[PDB]
Write a protein that binds this DNA or RNA. Sequence first.
DNA 1: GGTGTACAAGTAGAAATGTCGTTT
DNA 2: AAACGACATTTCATACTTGTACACCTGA
DNA 3: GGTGTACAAGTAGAAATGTCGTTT
DNA 4: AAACGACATTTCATACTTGTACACCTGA
DNA 5: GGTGTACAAGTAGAAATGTCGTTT
DNA 6: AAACGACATTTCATACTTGTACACCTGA
Lengths: 338, 338
Amino acid sequence: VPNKEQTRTVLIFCFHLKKTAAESHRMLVEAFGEQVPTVKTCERWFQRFKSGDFDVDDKEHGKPPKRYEDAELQALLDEDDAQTQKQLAEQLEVSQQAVSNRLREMGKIQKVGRWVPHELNERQMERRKNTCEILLSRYKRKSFLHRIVTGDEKWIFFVNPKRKKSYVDPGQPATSTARPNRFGKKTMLCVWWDQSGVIYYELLKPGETVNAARYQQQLINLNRALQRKRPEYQHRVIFLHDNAPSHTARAVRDTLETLNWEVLPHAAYSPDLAPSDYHLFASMGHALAEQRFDSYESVKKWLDEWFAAKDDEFYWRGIHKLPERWEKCVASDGKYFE
Amino acid sequence: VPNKEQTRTVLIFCFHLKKTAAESHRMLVEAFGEQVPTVKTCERWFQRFKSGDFDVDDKEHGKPPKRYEDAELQALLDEDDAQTQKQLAEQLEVSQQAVSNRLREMGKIQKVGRWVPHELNERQMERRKNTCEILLSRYKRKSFLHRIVTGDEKWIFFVNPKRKKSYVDPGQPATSTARPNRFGKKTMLCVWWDQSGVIYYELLKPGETVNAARYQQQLINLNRALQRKRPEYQKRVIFLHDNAPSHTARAVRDTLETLNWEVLPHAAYSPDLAPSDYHLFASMGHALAEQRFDSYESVKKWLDEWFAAKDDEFYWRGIHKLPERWEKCVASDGKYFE
DNA sequence: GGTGTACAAGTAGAAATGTCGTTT
DNA sequence: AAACGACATTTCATACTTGTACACCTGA
DNA sequence: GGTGTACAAGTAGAAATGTCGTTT
DNA sequence: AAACGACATTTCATACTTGTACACCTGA
DNA sequence: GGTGTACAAGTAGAAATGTCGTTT
DNA sequence: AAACGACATTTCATACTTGTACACCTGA
Ligand SMILES: [Mn+2]
């Protein structure tokens, strides 16, 4: 019993025995029986053998012509990056499943885009670009991160749920989780740190506020802590903090200039330029997930142990990111680079 | 110039030509040089050939043993539906990447869990069960949804941006979307409806509260418009609304009383049980995406086009889902059903 | 609810053959 | 007998169709 | 900033097949 | 020469391993 | 975040006397 | 002494009006 590939094989053999198409065909018919290609099909193959080959495959058969070739659909994404298949479909005369396939065929894949801090304003942009521009220049004259003490303030929710993902067979419930309350128990952490470590931090008790007055207390307390912790700030201290309604007030301005600290220029709506946000907290967020301290002091034991178990260089890295981190902001002409 | 399979193909041929084993090797040598398998394999082949040769394949050869039974990685999931490969791997005593593949080798895929309105108390769970049980029971006796009228308030943020997702080559960047302001401008929509459509609705001026006293005023105005829009009730309106502290006041309960409306019992923390929520706003939830509202007059404008644009089918359907919900709520024991 | 995607199955052009009369 | 030349036939990966499964969103 | 999943390339047992001396 | 039978040797789809690239979260 | 209803705990009358007149 | 009426003065007893705390909407 034979096959149309195996058949071709035999004929390669029958050929290499110096045998004619005819005396080859009648072999086949006697070995296998009457259902076996035509003499004409043997003669056919013979001609191909005298050129020489293993015709492992047929050459590609006939096929429908493409209704839209690649470079066309590619030009649609070049217009607008993120349209839906249903929707490039309409522009291409073709169905949806149709579009899915070629997208799969091309190198393409869908990814969920990034969240950006806030909708920036054409001024607000020139304003960032500049600060970045200025600070960066002033950097290269003489590095000053070595001096720089920075700080911010972030909420610590008491329970931090996040949706659980389950490995299950298609069409089954994946493990579901109950919503986090928006108006739930939460403290408020404010921490100041420098390139070496964490200098001093307060944990404002549940339902707590930071007012022009409050901040000064902290500021002065920070310095109190600073004296003994960084033994000898020869080199004047450089203070980087967000333009909160509180920090921006004239009351505090006075309390700052009297400590004589330098305030580093800062841009509105720019947490992506502020070490505490994009590096220190960013770490913490991973570390806080699925966690729930039920007591205010459990938060403190956690914070205390967290900072203590942090590496030393981890902070350095954070702070030292700043320069090229600006070089980026300016390369965007005051955009959010991501 | 053969391989080991074209080799069985020639020996299947030479077999039928009544050539002996050692006979076909002589031919095999002169056709394809001294480059082929040994006599011994021909002999071997030939015994197979004598009683159903049918080499469909090399019959499966050796392999390393498995380390964990498929069904043993399974028992891990029966414990925790939602683990990470790294984490299973560990208990399996084996590599993440290893586990990665037994997951596609078995059926399993990964899906995100539901978010669920509340961590439900042992009691609150049966508070629900009952109320469902209860309503579902009178429904069994005779449908009464024909005269059930319901409402609930819900927020309409002025800007609501969705995170945009995009088709791009691997490692290329997505599209980025500017975060929503946690607390921008928002109007607060109070709406009431029955199986025939929206009865009445008000759109509260941004930052507008709804207090025991203000609610009554609405209720009344609702009823005022009810005798007009539904003259049917001149010839018992079942009111379905949530245990809101505003809707729950001594004053309101006593106001409602002398309107002579029956208030359907409605279990606390049960928004999946109240049509307004799971059906009306849910329809809205979608058609609000990417939308912007420059002024409060647009939101009026936008509300009407929508409300009037939906056919009675849509509403009737929404209310008529109630029984199959209660049916569910009951044999879930009051747990938010899937 | 409402949407978006990708599998599942269908329904349409050259090569590889087949048929048949012609050439050696 | 052997091979060819010029038709018609049959073969099958392809480019698309519709139908629809089912992940995930949506109101809380 | 940290973590989680899949693609890539590499490294470890019985069938297929080989070598040789026996048996007809 | 043809075949076997017994003992040694080569072969390959397998089941894991390192490497990884990369989509995403993370912080406002 | 909003709000409202129950049960505080704290800051606002109607009976206790207290001090006078009296007169005999 | 001994009465007993006016009416200031000093408690005890309810009608207040903030106050704490728990409930239910909900959702960075
Ligand atoms: Mn801040």
